[PDB]
Amino acid sequence: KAGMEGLDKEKINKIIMEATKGSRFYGNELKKEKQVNQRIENMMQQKAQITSQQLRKAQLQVDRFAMELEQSRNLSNTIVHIDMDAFYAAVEMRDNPELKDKPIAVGSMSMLSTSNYHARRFGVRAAMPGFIAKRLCPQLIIVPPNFDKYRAVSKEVKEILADYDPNFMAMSLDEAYLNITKHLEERQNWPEDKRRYFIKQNSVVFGTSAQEVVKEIRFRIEQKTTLTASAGIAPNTMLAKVCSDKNKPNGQYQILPNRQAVMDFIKDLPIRKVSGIGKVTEKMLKALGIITCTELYQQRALLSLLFSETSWHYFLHISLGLGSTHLTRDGERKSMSVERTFSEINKAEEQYSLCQELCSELAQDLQKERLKGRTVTIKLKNVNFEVKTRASTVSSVVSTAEEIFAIAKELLKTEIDADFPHPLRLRLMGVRISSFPN
DNA sequence: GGGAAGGACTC
DNA sequence: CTAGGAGTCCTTCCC
Ligand SMILES: [Mg+2]
Ligand SMILES: [Mg+2]
């Protein structure tokens, strides 16, 4: 909940529930929770069959591993995570001044991509459907998303970022990591005028410290675009991101570059505030008595024998406050996809032609990157939100509508057939091309 | 070690 | 169109 707290979680939760109670969605949502409780159940079973000598041995490895990490802990880099405030809303408020005074969201009546802060006061958030949102805030204006407009402001701000780190990596249209470690060195020798900017006396000079260079960035960002950003400063990416939210909107937070600072932050940081730990992992760990990053580190024993090698390796990093100190600046796309949810469709005649408009639309997007690919996956979703997913890869490549529809046509047919005589009651369909030459 | 199927997570 | 769409990475399962 990254914005408004101190909310009437009673009148809000009641409304959300009344508008979800007997829904077809909530039904599936309930079966999911059952499925997640089962998963916990097998974990809790696996736990019950561990012997203290088994556990004790785990302690040896994990502590040795820890010790290795701890020795290669890097506190030399200053990483900044920039995170625009209520981004899609804000852009729209900028574009259309009228809206600047009221609660608004960007999305549809059936789903919100975000919502400006005034609306968050009513508990209106992203991922929440616009019709529930409107019940929370009957005067909410929902604005349709216009990605071209958002991409502009994105590259409008990416222009400020390159100054402080030509190598900065963007994560989305409103987020990027910067490693200002090198800028911070050169900046120590910068005279006033090189760090003095004219407002909207009318001028300010920014200091020489990381804290200031980030104030300066945020300032330039607000002045050039009209929008406000928040920022996190810390030794590595994982912390920098947690920090960029500690003071939203329009503020910033630093963890100073020393072990203890890190350690003091982490201590009581709820594990869910970390990027990559979701709703499920939270619940699974809460089940083992794990809520804060301290509790996560103290169970490093158990974790290495209940979870995939990659999950505990990862969990351990977080528990010790480690993260990336080096922005990969990688890239290259793994897949491209087009999918669409719609008022029910059970007629195979249209199911086939929807798959065509999709395959066809995909081809064009795929075309603009001049990309070609071997694998093709369709994705159908019942009227009950159950999702199927059927793949097929050929051995040539395939690129245009007709050829990509060629394969998707068939995959669709097999599932219509598989359920015959009963037709497939669909709310969603989608088509994903992947495995590109490389 | 190249598939296919289902999911967790995040924006 | 009255619970999105887009993408990546993982976990498991078979030649
Ligand atoms: Mg943001
Ligand atoms: Mg999280």
Residue numbers in the entry: 25 to 224, 281 to 518
What's the publication's text?
Oxygen-free radicals formed during normal aerobic cellular metabolism attack bases in DNA and 7,8-dihydro-8-oxoguanine (8-oxoG) is one of the major lesions formed. It is amongst the most mutagenic lesions in cells because of its dual coding potential, wherein 8-oxoG(syn) can pair with an A in addition to normal base pairing of 8-oxoG(anti) with a C. Human DNA polymerase κ (Polκ) is a member of the newly discovered Y-family of DNA polymerases that possess the ability to replicate through DNA lesions. The recently discovered Y-family of DNA polymerases permit the continuity of the replication fork by allowing replication through such lesions that impede the replicative polymerases. However, whereas yeast and human Polη replicate through 8-oxoG by predominantly inserting a C, human Polκ is more efficient at inserting an A opposite the lesion than a C. In this respect, Polκ differs even from Dpo4 (its homologue in Sufolobus solfataricus) which prefers to insert a C opposite 8-oxoG. The crystal structure of Polκ in ternary complex with a template-primer DNA and an incoming nucleotide, reveals encirclement of the DNA by this unique N-terminal extension, referred to as the N-clasp.
We crystallized the Polκ catalytic core (aa 19-526) in ternary complex with a 13-nt/18-nt primer/template presenting the 8-oxoG lesion as the templating base and with dATP as the incoming nucleotide. The cocrystals diffract to 3.2 Å resolution with synchrotron radiation (Brookhaven National Laboratory) and there are two ternary complexes (A and B) in the crystallographic asymmetric unit. Polκ encircles the 8-oxoG adducted DNA in much the same way as in the ternary complex with undamaged DNA. The structure reveals an 8-oxoG(syn):A(anti) Hoogsteen base pair in the Polκ active site. The template 8-oxoG lesion is rotated to the syn conformation, wherein its Hoogsteen edge (N7 and O6) is presented for hydrogen bonding with the Watson-Crick edge of dATP (N1 and N6), which remains in the anti conformation. The C1′-C1′ distance across the 8-oxoG(syn):A(anti) Hoogsteen base pair is ∼10.96 Å, which is comparable to the distance (∼10.86 Å) in the nascent A(anti):T (anti) base pair in the ternary complex with undamaged DNA. The polymerase superimposes with an rms deviation of 0.54 Å when compared to the polymerase in the undamaged complex. The O8 of 8-oxoG (syn) is solvent exposed and does not sterically impinge on any residues in the Polκ active site. In addition, the syn conformation of 8-oxoG is stabilized by Met135 emanating from the fingers domain. A Mg2+ ion occupies a position corresponding to “metal B” in replicative polymerases, and is coordinated in the basal octahedral plane by the unesterified oxygens of dATP β- and γ-phosphates and the carboxylates of Asp107 and Asp198, and at the apical positions by the α-phosphate and the main chain carbonyl of Met108.
